[PDB]
Structure formats: C-alpha cells, structure tokens
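Why run this: before we spend reagent on co-expression, it is cheaper to look at a predicted model of the complex and decide which construct boundaries make sense. The entries below are exactly what would go into the expression plan.
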Amino acid sequence: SVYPKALRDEYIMSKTLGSGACGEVKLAFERKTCKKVAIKIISKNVETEIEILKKLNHPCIIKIKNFFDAEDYYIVLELMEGGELFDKVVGNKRLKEATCKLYFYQMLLAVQYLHENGIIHRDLKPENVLLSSQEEDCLIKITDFGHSKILGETSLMRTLCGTPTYLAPEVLVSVGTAGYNRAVDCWSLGVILFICLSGYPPFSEHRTQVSLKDQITSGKYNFIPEVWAEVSEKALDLVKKLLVVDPKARFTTEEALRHPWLQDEDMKRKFQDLLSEENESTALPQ
Amino acid sequence: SVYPKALRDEYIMSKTLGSGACGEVKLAFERKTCKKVAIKIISKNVETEIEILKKLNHPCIIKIKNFFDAEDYYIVLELMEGGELFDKVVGNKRLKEATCKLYFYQMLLAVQYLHENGIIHRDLKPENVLLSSQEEDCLIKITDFGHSKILGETSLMRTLCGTPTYLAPEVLVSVGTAGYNRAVDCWSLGVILFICLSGYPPFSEHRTQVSLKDQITSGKYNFIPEVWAEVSEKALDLVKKLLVVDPKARFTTEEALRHPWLQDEDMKRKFQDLLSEENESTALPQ
Ligand SMILES: C/C(=N\NC(=N)NO)c1ccc(NC(=O)Nc2ccc(/C(C)=N/N/C(N)=N/O)cc2)cc1
Ligand SMILES: C/C(=N\NC(=N)NO)c1ccc(NC(=O)Nc2ccc(/C(C)=N/N/C(N)=N/O)cc2)cc1
Ligand SMILES: [Mg+2]
Ligand SMILES: [Mg+2]
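The model came back. Tokens follow.
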C-alpha cells in the first residue's frame, strides 16, 4: 500500500520506531517546520481516543498534532525521543529508586488529571509510558487512549431516581461498588511501580503452580526478598497500598501523592526544572 | 406551542389517551387512510429506541409507523385500543387466573424474542404492556424501548483476550456474573405476574417496617395467604422461580415458557386464534 495523499502532503515518512498489536509507530518529518514527529498507525475506539486527546492538556499526557482517517488510521503526535518505559525495565533491568520515584510521580500527576477530568485510561502499562529523552532524568508522557472510558451520568443514577417496585436486586446490590471503575488505573500503576522498583512482575506464571488469575484475585504478589532488600521500606509500602484487592480500599492517586515516598523535595525540584526546560514560552506581561 | 408542520401534513391530532413522566400519548388520524394511530410525545435515548423499534418484528411488540424529531419527539405507533395493563390491575383489581396466563404467555414470547435478538428491555411494568382491545381475551404488545440495552461484544471480552499482567482483580471477579444483564427483565416479569395474579405488589412500603430495598435484595415478597388462596399452586410456583435473587439461578424466559403453568393447550389455542384474527394477509400461492 501507500501512505494517504493528505498525510504525504504535510509529512515525509521515515523509519519504524516501535510497534504494537494494532500497528506501528513511525518517525516522520513535518514539512512546514522540518521537525520530527511520531506517527502511530492503527490498522483498520479511535474516534473517541482522538476526541479525548484533543481535549486534554497536561505536561505528562501526549498531545495529538494531526489525524488522518484513511485505509488505516494515522495519529500524528509529538516524538518522545526516549521511547517506551518498557525498554528500561525489560530483561530484569532496573532503574534507580530515585528514577522510579521521578517517573512514578509524573504517572500519578497524569492519572490524577485524567480522573479529575472523568477519564479512565484502562491500559496503563510500560509500553504506554513514553520518555522525553535518553537521559535518566526526563519527562514522561502517558499515551494510548484506545480503550479509555469517559465518565458521565450513568444508567444506574437514572434508575435510582424512581421507585424500585420492578427493579431487580442485583441492580440495588451494584450500588455499593458503583463509581470506582477509576480504581483499575491505580491497580495498574501499582503493577508498573512494582516492576520499575524490582525489575520483575508481581503476578506471573513463571516458576509457580498458582494460576495468574488466582495470584491477582488473592492479591498475593511474588515477593523475592533478595531483589527487594535494596529498595526502601517506603517504596514497598506504597506498592502495597496500590495492590489492594478491594477497589474501595485501594489507594487513589491523591492518596498515593500524599504518601511518604513521594514527599521528596529534591525529586519535585527536578520535575519542575525539567518542565520549564521543555517549554518555549513567548513573552509575558510584567 | 404547535405540532410540527411535517406531522400535521400527514396526521390530524385528537384527544390525549394517556401520559407518562416524559410526555403523553395522543389519538391521531392518518390522513391517507382515515385510520386511528397513537402518537407518543416525548418532551425534549430516543434515537436508539427508534432504531430498535424499526428492526424488531414480533406480534407482541409494538411497531413504529413514523417518527418526527422537532421541538419534541413524536413517535407514531399502532393504536392499542385496550390501553395499558396498568388500568386493569390498579386499585387491587384482579384478572382471572386464565387471563393472567394468556397475557403472561405473550409477555414471555415478547421478552424471549427480545433476548434472542440481543435486546434487554429494562423498563417492564404494567404501563408498558398494551392491550389490543377492551375484550379480556386479547393480544398484548410491549412498548417503551427508551432505556433498552443492545448486547454485543463487551469490553470485558476484549480484556480477556490478553494476559492479565496489569489487570485489576475486580475485573476478573466480574467474569463470574457477566452476561446476565437480561435477567433483570425476568425479575420485572415476575413482579408483573405477581401483581396480575394477586392485585397487589410483592415489594412495597405499605404497612411494613422493612425498607423497600431490603425486601427486594432479600427476595422476601409480601405474601398475604387470603389473597392467594384462590390462585393455583402452579402459578405461584412460577412467580417464585422468577423472583429469585441470584440472577444466574433466576428463571430465563425459556424456562418460564416450559413451566407447568404455561402448558395449557386451551390458552395457546386462544392466542393463535387472536393472532390470525388480527392479520390482513393478502393472497398466498397454493
Ligand atoms: C524514540 C523512539 N524510538 N527510537 C528507536 N526505535 N530508535 O531505534 C520511540 C519508540 C517508540 C515510541 N512509541 C510511541 O510513540 N508509542 C505510542 C503508542 C501508542 C500511541 C497511541 C496514541 N495509540 N493509540 C492506540 N489506539 N493504540 O492502539 C501513540 C504512541 C516513541 C518513540
Ligand atoms: C385506547 C387508550 N386510551 N383510551 C382512553 N384513554 N380512553 O379514554 C390508550 C391509552 C394508553 C395508551 N398508551 C400507549 O400507547 N403507551 C405508550 C407508552 C410508551 C410508548 C413509547 C414508545 N415510549 N417511549 C419512550 N421513550 N417513553 O419514554 C408508546 C406508547 C394507548 C391507548
Ligand atoms: Mg492499548
Ligand atoms: Mg420507560
């Protein structure tokens, strides 16, 4: 096949940078500026994803630059020159605890911002955390809103306005837990944090007879003492509060951000430095 | 206000026949035929409702004749000259067990047809069961698809295709009960059947200190022996199988249709007679 004419009109396509199950990510150059962009190709919910990407505005969430709906979908985004977090943690590799904290703080700010704006990501994983440079101290941005959920008034809320004369008991039972769907993102963050800190996954079929499903529903992560000995007590404590099986008891992003592990003025200074460094501001009054 | 010009072009509007929270039902005459129709007015999901009504084809489900999207919504439907089931059961009035069986058989055929076609009604109640004539032995049709749900591939199904490395435990737990949303219609049918047979609601705040919610979630309906003494054992048995709190154990429409109470050749003959009577067939080959 060929790239669609409208895309070719504005961009010169280059090398493949990465790939997923749905397609791949290409390097491209915007003709107008001669600057690099990334183009995510999705082989034929993208429409809602685009709507979400256009509305959001946070330094730790990827921005969309362009969109082409042709034989495949083409999403033009800023190029994250550090690539995927996945490549930093694969093969038991492990980030310094300080680096983990810097990245995780930013993931939390991003997810907090999503939840404030009524968006649940639903696919948080190292592949979807992008790094701004090849330097260890860098900005991160969350990507892939392909299976995200937009919160709004539910059918349940409409249901509860009337008298339940004809209403099934399971619907009334569901009221106890409704409105905690956002907690799935906090669980995923917990798994990512566990992986970053230890270089291995908390739940895996590797050298165990307990099924993956049972490990997860029981909350019984694989704790290898020798791997963790070098990690602080505070970091593990936060992991434990995120990997709580009851979604109503699980730490929210706000609670995680208040945790002793993230009360680190050095880390927060580094983040703020990195932010101002990124930005091309233009003159301001006064 | 006035009726929209496009509606006036085709219909002459007459008296109010009934009303709901969302609007009212008017008598109207189609100019082309000089025949009576009903027009449901909904004051400004109707679009999906119309899509559902147009696709369905069953003798016990109302048919749409026309639709106007103006200042309000106008849905033109066949006129059900018997009006709402609600008016037959209000004020402790009660239908003969035989009439209950005839109506309930038809409600079951209609809901069975919905579930086969991947539609959950979600608002079954006596107001939404319409009668074809003022005669006791008549056809019934289900109406109001304003809060119905269309079944299809779920997000959960897509979720289960991958490895749950990052997946929250509540999602895996939800797998045990997923795909039983249709059972809410069977519960509502059970409540309707209870009301038709007894002339009173199974769950109500009337002369009780148990909250409505607790009556329902416990499955503890109000059984007044003296009201029920004249009702058959078989009829009550079916009610009991529909008012089961566990949605996976609850009778389906298929199970209800196989129940001893509905193994009534006289009732089924009456239904078939009523069907052929309704229809204006045109010549057939052979
Ligand atoms: C610098 C670099 N690579 N450098 C290199 N290989 N040098 O040899 C590099 C590598 C990988 C990436 N990734 C990347 O950009 N991901 C990404 C993933 C998903 C989406 C979206 C919106 N998805 N939306 C949907 N619906 N999905 O299904 C967008 C971007 C970026 C830079
Ligand atoms: C013969 C008669 N009345 N005769 C009389 N009063 N004589 O004095 C009579 C009375 C009432 C009715 N009802 C009636 O037709 N209901 C009805 C309810 C709902 C809908 C729908 C599609 N709703 N869709 C939505 N989204 N809703 O929110 C359609 C029809 C019919 C005939
Ligand atoms: Mg994804
Ligand atoms: Mg309704």
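Chain B touches chain A at residues 123-125, 147, 155, 158, 163-173, 177, 180, 183-184, 187-188, 191-192, 201, 203-204, 212-213, 216-217, 219, 245, 247 (CB under 8 Å). The pocket of YCF (ligand 2) is lined by residues B 17-18, 20, 22, 25, 38, 40, 42, 46, 49, 75, 77, 80-81, 83-84, 130, 143-144, 146 (CB under 6 Å). Bring this page to Monday's planning discussion.
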